[PDB]
Write a protein that binds this ligand. Structure first.
Ligand code: 570
Ligand code: L79
Lengths: 253, 211, 7, 9
């Protein structure tokens, strides 16, 4: 494809990304740093400040997850070629890509000490999350570890918009009916991402490779997360998970 | 050139040459060859002895799966083990592992066959898996990250010289790792399932790595 | 079902 | 790990 096409594609994705996601990375980091006058997020460091504690956080993350799925689903439909895909594959691509994207974007809201929550109105410390009882205290730590390494790449919303699209158009998801169309689209997205990184990050070496590498880390983070939910289901008789997440998780990986 | 692909290819060629039981035995066998393989990978042997142990313990599973998966390109719907045994889909769908087996064939084997990755490419991808800076315990994670990046550079160059007609081959190669990882984790889950049950478990070395 | 509707 | 460690050296 001509560079003009790839640039047009990069801009298209960035624009629909801005429309699909309320809190961008630019805003979040501005907040985390405090270079914006609106309201410094409330800091939740323990039980008193938060006002079972594990259940509330459980509900909090669950509610945010459901919103993200819908947001990601809307963004996917704006990717050239996606809606022209067999409906079944669209569902499959979303089924397996949403959590990888959720954790990718969760990184934009974290730093070595915490994570913005509730539209960026709150800031839950890492320490606090690691202190939750039973298996509840080891859910976020894996994400924080990932976040730190991922954020070191210093990607901006324009970089992320394409990366997320690349994750969605993965032709290796179990159950796909027509792999070729999906791979052709990802190919165009990959080239656009490569050009984007070269122009946006001229002094950063092998950034394209390091970013693609992160796609395998996301696989691990997702499987490890499912397993922890397996534990909870086992050690918490009253599991109960939102029906949408149940659907996405039914026979996942 | 810090990370020559010819040496990586040599590392590959230098070691080419109950189904669940036959598979576990083959794996046990390839663990020994894996060591010899690692030593032939430029700079691997220069790392502290303790780091080498860590890297191999963390990536042996994926390293061996990538290996037989590429070797399996030669057969229709089966898996070619190093010991020469050919595991067919039916046998898998008889030990209660047809699902994961089908993932290997579709998400790895067929993918490697369709883009026809050569041995140098497999070698580089495997080296990348080897130099995992995120392995817990490394004396210098950054140093390992540097080695991994050196393989990125060498492989990218190799792809641009060997396959100038396909700009995105490099990315397509790096995108084989996600499946390898997700599949590796599941094989790990199965192995740990076949272990904590016994009944004539696997060989000692594989068992050692399985702790 | 929900994913189908969302689209 | 006696085996891995033994082989590597
Ligand atoms: C860390 C945090 O806290 C709040 C928050 C707390 C209190 C009130 C309001 C919000 N927002 C965030 C950031 C959200 O960051 C996110 C983190 C994870 C997910 C994935 C989601 N997990 C769950 C799905 C259902 C129930 C629980 C979870 C969990 O992840 C979980 C978390 C802690 C313990 C146990 C489980 C899944 O679909 O698999 C989405 C967003
Ligand atoms: C067939 C399949 C997917 C299902 C069931 C089990 C869990 C038994 C399984 C295990 C493996 C193994 C575990 C990890 C490294 C492994 O290396 C292996 C052989 C390589 C060779 O001959 O060159 C087999 C293997 C590899 C594959 C499978």
């Amino acid at each position: 494809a001509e560079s003009a096409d790839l640039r047009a594609l990069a801009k298209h994705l960035y624009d629909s990304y801005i429309k699909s996601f309320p809190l961008t990375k630019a805003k979040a980091r501005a907040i985390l740093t405090g270079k914006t006058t609106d309201k410094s997020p409330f800091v939740i460091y323990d039980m008193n400040s938060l006002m079972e504690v594990a259940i509330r956080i459980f509900q909090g993350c669950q509610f945010r997850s459901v919103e993200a799925v819908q947001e990601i689903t809307e963004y996917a439909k704006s990717i050239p070629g996606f809606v022209n895909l067999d409906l079944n594959d669209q569902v499959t691509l979303l089924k397996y890509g949403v959590h990888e994207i959720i954790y990718t974007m969760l990184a934009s809201l974290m730093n070595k000490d915490g994570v913005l929550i509730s539209e960026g109105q709150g800031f839950m410390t890492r320490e606090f999350l690691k202190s939750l009882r039973k298996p509840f205290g080891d859910f976020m730590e894996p994400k924080f570890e990932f976040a730190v390494k991922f954020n070191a790449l210093e990607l901006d919303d324009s970089d992320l918009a394409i990366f997320i699209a690349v994750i969605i158009l993965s032709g290796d998801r179990p159950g796909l009916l027509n792999v070729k169309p999906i791979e052709d689209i990802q190919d165009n997205l990959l080239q656009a991402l490569e050009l984007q990184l070269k122009l946006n990050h001229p002094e950063s070496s092998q950034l394209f490779a390091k970013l693609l590498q992160k796609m395998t880390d996301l696989r691990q983070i997702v499987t490890e997360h499912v397993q922890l939910l397996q534990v909870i289901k086992k050690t918490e008789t009253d599991m109960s998970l939102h029906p949408l997440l149940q659907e996405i998780y039914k026979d996942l990986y | 050139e810090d990370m020559p692909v010819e040496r990586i290819l040599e590392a590959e060629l230098a070691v080419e040459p109950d189904p669940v039981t036959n598979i576990c035995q083959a794996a046990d066998k390839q663990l020994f060859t894996l060591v010899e393989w690692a030593k032939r990978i430029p700079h691997f042997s220069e790392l502290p002895l303790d780091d080498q142990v860590i890297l191999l313990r963390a990536g042996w599973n994926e390293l061996l799966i990538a290996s037989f998966s590429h070797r399996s390109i030669a057969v229709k719907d089966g898996i070619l083990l190093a010991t020469g045994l050919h595991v067919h889909r039916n046998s898998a769908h008889s030990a209660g592992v047809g699902a994961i087996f089908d993932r290997v064939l579709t998400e790895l084997v067929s993918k490697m066959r369709d883009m026809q990755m050569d041995k140098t490419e497999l070698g580089c991808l495997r080296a990348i898996v080897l130099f995992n800076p995120d392995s817990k315990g490394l004396s210098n994670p950054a140093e390992v990250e540097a080695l991994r990046e050196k393989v990125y550079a060498s492989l990218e160059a190799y792809c641009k010289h060997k396959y100038p007609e396909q700009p995105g081959r490099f990315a397509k190669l790096l995108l084989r790792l996600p499946a390898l990882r997700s599949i590796g984790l599941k094989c790990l889950e199965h192995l740990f399932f076949f272990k904590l049950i016994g009944d004539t478990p696997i060989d000692t070395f594989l068992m050692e790595m399985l702790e | 079902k929900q994913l189908s509707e969302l689209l | 790990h006696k085996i891995l460690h033994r082989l590597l050296q």
